[PDB]
Design a protein around this nucleic acid. Structure first.
Length: 640
DNA sequence: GTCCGACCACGCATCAGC
């Protein structure tokens, strides 16, 4: 009846009764918006999952076809990752449509949303009432916005955004703007959406003619029996979605065959991307041999490049996907021509887990990550390429029809070495080492950096050595040089500027501008920005103490060049200790400019805050000459 | 430990404005 009072967070929620739309009718967007309200209101994940599941239950029973747009709207996605659909809507475009729709000045709303940290609050705060917004239609308008390209397309995107804002009632304007800005801020993402959908199709099975005979399949169960039944049902959907992270493929099959029979039809196959195996960072060599004590592990290098899933289809078709299931086949014409040189004549199909690293041919050495990012993406010709790549395969998932996900790593490494041939500077296995004692491990870790690598990989060989990422999504372990305490390029830099925070950091500063001391010019040269490493209490100690140091104008001895203008200029007085992974040749920052490259400065890779240095003063800080020394001291730069 | 969302540098790709 009235969707304004729709409460999906009600005890003993009845899917057909407590809903707010008649069967056969389309799901109104206000129902999705009121549920977002009930989800952001709480902080318990088990509470959000149940609230979202209460909507999904009403969807599969009243409007089954609207299930896919509801899931995508909840995920704030536009489709499968390999589709490549992107909104192309910046903040300035969204703020332009907000002030245009509500009749306000651009400078009034641009300064507004900056102080709030959330555009949804500005949009919500004359014309005849338009028809209510539908969930599927709103999702179809998001795709319509993303498909617009070419000249005058930005203008065309603004009319569509304006059309939704003039039709938004109650709370819909808050969440439309949040979705269009890519910051839904629900505390609910892919893992909770999957659990809420697995719970909905189990409690209210789909494919059930009105009247729904089973609205709560957990009625005749003990409390322990229901939590166990919903958990095993959830892992069926989680593992299937891990081999096919595609909702456009799973939901139609799930609607017709149920959750239990879903693996029998949604199976891992070449050409369909799969979610890659991730690695968990660990402190030192002791935490490695502790969590992995009762299991023999291998130790492979960690290469600084781009992860590349090489799918080989029956018939020669080759597709390369990225870590986020994005199509990168047009990125590597140079690879698709070198496929036969890596597989034996008996290999008819495979899925390889490799890492693309920029390779120099004349020097026969590895190039830094910046050189790899200079490749042209898009759809290059093999003649116009310039930055060469060398594959470092470290896993095998699919081979000649059979899938290798349920096999230990020791088995996959055997088939990978037997059915594939190495090529120096083209295809070579990740340098591995099966070792248990700490002496060779610490020596192998230093050998990786000497051979221009980030660190070492730790993976079990038998015990929990499967590729089922649904059980342990971070079963692998990272061991970089910057993780070990007492080692790593630590710098004592000065804060000069600070940026207003957004979302979780709204009302505070979310970032800070850091500078190094150029003694020759007697200037403070901005080196990087810093927005991670602080504790929430430490960020308040910084938000208050630095608030007495705000300057209306930058000091004359400050030099930031093409860096982002800080929202607040600060009196240089605070010296902070900052840990970083690497030193990069910056095209934007002026720190140590001219000391290494004639046209570029130096910035920090992965900078994070460590500790305030109250004893040190701005003059007693890391010099630009010191910064230039650390750059040439780096291994990847020394090997060049 | 899991999950989520704050934030970092860099460089190709795109488009409003000229």
């Amino acid at each position: 009846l009235d969707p304004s009072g729709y409460n999906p967070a009600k005890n003993n929620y009845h899917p057909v009764e407590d809903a707010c739309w008649k069967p056969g009718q389309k799901v109104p967007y206000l129902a999705v918006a009121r549920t977002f309200e009930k989800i952001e209101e709480v902080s318990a994940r088990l509470r959000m999952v149940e609230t979202l599941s209460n909507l999904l239950r009403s969807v599969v029973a009243l409007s089954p076809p609207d299930l896919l747009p509801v899931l995508y709207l909840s995920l704030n996605h536009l489709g499968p990752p390999q589709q490549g659909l992107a909104l192309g809507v910046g903040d300035g475009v969204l703020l332009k449509a907000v002030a245009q729709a509500t009749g306000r000045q651009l400078e009034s709303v641009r300064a507004e949303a900056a102080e709030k940290g959330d555009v949804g609050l500005v949009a919500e705060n004359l014309m005849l009432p338009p028809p209510p917004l539908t969930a599927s239609g709103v999702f179809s308008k998001f795709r319509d916005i993303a498909r617009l390209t070419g000249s005058a397309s930005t203008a065309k995107k603004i009319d569509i955004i304006k059309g939704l804002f003039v039709a938004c009632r109650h709370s819909e304007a808050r969440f439309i703007a949040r979705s269009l800005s890519g910051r839904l801020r629900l505390g609910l993402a892919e893992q909770s959406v999957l659990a809420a959908l697995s719970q909905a199709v189990s409690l209210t099975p789909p494919g059930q003619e009105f009247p729904p005979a089973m609205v709560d399949a957990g009625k005749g169960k003990t409390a322990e029996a229901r939590k166990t039944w919903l958990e095993e049902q959830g892992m069926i959907l989680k593992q299937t979605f891990c081999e096919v992270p595609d909702l456009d493929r799973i939901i139609p099959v799930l609607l017709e065959h149920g959750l239990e029979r879903l693996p029998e039809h949604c199976k891992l196959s070449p050409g369909i991307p799969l979610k890659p195996m991730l690695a968990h960072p660990t402190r030192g060599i002791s935490e490695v041999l502790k969590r992995f004590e009762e299991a023999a592990f291998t130790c492979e290098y960690k290469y600084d490049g781009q992860r590349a899933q090489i799918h080989a289809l029956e018939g020669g078709e080759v597709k390369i996907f990225s870590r986020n299931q994005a199509d990168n086949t047009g990125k590597y014409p140079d690879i698709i021509s070198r496929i036969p040189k890596i597989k034996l004549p008996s290999v008819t199909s495979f899925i390889l887990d490799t890492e693309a690293v920029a390779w120099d041919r004349e020097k026969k050495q590895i190039q830094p990550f910046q050189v790899l990012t200079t490749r042209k993406r898009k759809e290059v010709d093999a003649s116009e390429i310039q930055v060469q790549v060398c594959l470092y395969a470290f896993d095998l998932i699919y081979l000649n029809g059979e899938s290798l996900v349920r096999e230990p790593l020791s088995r996959r490494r055997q088939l990978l070495r037997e059915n594939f041939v190495e090529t120096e500077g083209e295809f070579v296995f990740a340098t591995s080492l099966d070792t248990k004692d700490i002496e060779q491990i610490a020596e192998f870790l230093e050998q990786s950096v000497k051979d221009s690598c980030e660190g070492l990989m730790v993976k079990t060989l038998d015990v929990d050595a499967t590729y089922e990422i649904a059980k342990r999504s971070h079963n692998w372990l990272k061991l970089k040089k910057d993780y070990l305490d007492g080692v790593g390029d630590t710098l004592d830099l000065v804060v000069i500027g600070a940026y207003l925070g957004r979302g979780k950091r709204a009302g505070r500063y979310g970032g800070f501008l850091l500078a190094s001391y150029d003694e020759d010019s007697e200037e403070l040269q901005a080196i990087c920005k810093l927005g991670t490493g602080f504790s929430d209490e430490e960020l308040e100690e910084h938000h208050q103490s630095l608030k007495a140091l705000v300057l209306p104008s930058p000091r004359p001895y400050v030099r930031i060049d093409g860096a982002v203008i800080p929202d607040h200029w600060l009196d240089p007085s605070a010296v902070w200790e900052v840990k970083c992974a690497d030193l990069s040749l910056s095209p934007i920052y002026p720190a140590a400019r001219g000391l290494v490259d004639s046209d570029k400065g130096i910035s920090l890779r992965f900078p994070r805050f460590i500790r305030v240095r109250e004893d040190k003063q701005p003059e007693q800080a890391t010099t630009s000459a010191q910064v230039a020394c650390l750059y040439r001291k780096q291994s990847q730069i020394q090997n060049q």
